[PDB]
UniProtKB/TrEMBL annotation, chain A:
It is found in: Virion. Belongs to the Leviviricetes capsid protein family. The keyword RNA-binding applies. Homodimer. The capsid proteins form dimers that assemble by group of 5. Twelve such pentamers are linked together with free dimers. The homodimers binds to the viral RNA via an operator hairpin, but also to many other RNA sequences in the viral genome; this interaction probably shifts the virus from the replicative to the assembly phase and ensures specific encapsidation of the viral genome. Pfam families: Levi_coat (PF01819). The keyword Kinase does not apply. Acts as a translational repressor of viral replicase synthesis late in infection. This latter function is the result of capsid protein interaction with an RNA hairpin which contains the replicase ribosome-binding site. Capsid protein self-assembles to form an icosahedral capsid with a T=3 symmetry, about 26 nm in diameter, and consisting of 89 capsid proteins dimers (178 capsid proteins). Involved in viral genome encapsidation through the interaction between a capsid protein dimer and the multiple packaging signals present in the RNA genome. The capsid also contains 1 copy of the A2 maturation protein. Keywords: Capsid protein, RNA-binding, T=3 icosahedral capsid protein, Translation regulation, Virion. This is Capsid protein. GO terms for molecular function: RNA binding; structural molecule activity. Coiled coil: none annotated. The gene is cp. Its main location: virion. GO terms for cellular component: T=3 icosahedral viral capsid.
UniProtKB/TrEMBL annotation, chain C:
It holds the Pfam family Levi_coat. One of its GO terms (molecular function) is RNA binding. InterPro entries: Levivir_coat (IPR002703), Phage_RNA-type_capsid (IPR015954). GO terms for cellular component: T=3 icosahedral viral capsid. It is found in: Virion. This is Capsid protein. Acts as a translational repressor of viral replicase synthesis late in infection. This latter function is the result of capsid protein interaction with an RNA hairpin which contains the replicase ribosome-binding site. Belongs to the Leviviricetes capsid protein family. The keyword RNA-binding applies.
Length: 125, 123, 123, 123
């Protein structure tokens, strides 16, 4: 409803950034898109439900391609898929949810072990 | 390796930070905990798999249980969590940097999804 | 805290069929009469955010009919659905009115329940 | 016919009721209408069908718009509803009375399901 606006999906500090405008909200799943192109655009999906007697299950997906001219018609060489889940108590206080989103913002920081084990093409340990 | 190091998880920019020390590595699941009280402190689990010729599938779990005294300290509730990350193998360093850049860009405070999480009503 | 028990059928006394909660997982509720799967009634419910701004409740009911023959056997089950779609910015009065629309539609002498109980067709 | 009458779709205990009125029948799809205007009126649509073998399946839609006038009467937000009621062919009078009583019991005034619908929350 009030959280269905366009937003920056990859930040390059200016011109090189990419935004996504909302496209659909149907059958329970949201959808943000970068451009109407079906094979050159990022993608964000999300929903919400009530998993258990006390736990909502926020699920979120991303899809990030990389395209090249490849002559001429640019095409999606590959799609770095992604998933996410977040099981949050129904009556969990607002402060606790801020803390959880802070935990994500901290786990994937600039130089943490997990972004390092992604960038360096390696595995963990 | 040098990726198995204690790292700040909930960084409140100073006094309110949280550090999880590395604790275990069995069957590939590198496991950080926060304190000796496993039933009272945070947890992070991470692992990688490549059971194909094109797809490296990561997987990360976090558990952030709120603490509370009881009529005795035990975990009132644990906000569980999952994650996955499928990356094509022939993707270079830059493109994986870009996927992680998507992660920072998704969960920043000025974005819809973290606001929806912090404002539980359905997006 | 609306995940409680209730009387689904009132037989004018002690012949009432009651159901109590039995499960709530994978976004699917469940009430049950008795643990015998091939014997009990069944209520299932969920909730989603299907359209742009529309909360779409769905409610299923299953009321099998039994008869001992030689040994209770589910002779046939009268399945059922319900898809109640309510826009999000709805007050309490309008939801009261929707529930009263349900109550009025399926009353005693109304054409639709009379059609059901006479096993005929409309008009 | 004999079951194509007008009923009180929303009984407000007196003068506040919404008396629908039969208006149409095409393709085996009955249709009541509240007010002659086709943009501010309730609408009930009850059809029956019978696959050749074992099941008679009904269908009942109820549309409950909330009116507004702030320039000009127009449907502010339609609150639709759907329904199905699958019944085996040889279900006699008693079993049809029982399933209609299943409806008359589930949607009572104090059951969990009507309250959950009237609160706009999770079940």
């Amino acid at each position: 409803a009030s959280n269905f606006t366009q937003f920056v999906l990859v930040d390059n500090g200016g011109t090189g950034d990419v935004t996504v405008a909302p496209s659909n909200f149907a059958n329970g799943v949201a959808e943000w898109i970068s451009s109407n192109s079906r094979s050159q655009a990022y993608k964000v999906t999300a929903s919400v439900r009530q998993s258990s007697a006390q736990n909502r299950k926020y699920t979120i997906k991303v899809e990030v391609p990389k395209v090249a001219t490849c002559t001429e018609l640019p095409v999606a060489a590959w799609r770095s898929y992604l998933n996410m889940e977040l099981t949050i108590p129904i009556f969990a206080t607002n402060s606790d949810c801020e803390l959880i989103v802070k935990a994500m913002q901290g786990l994937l920081k600039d130089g943490n072990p997990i972004p390092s084990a992604i960038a360096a093409n390696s595995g963990i340990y």
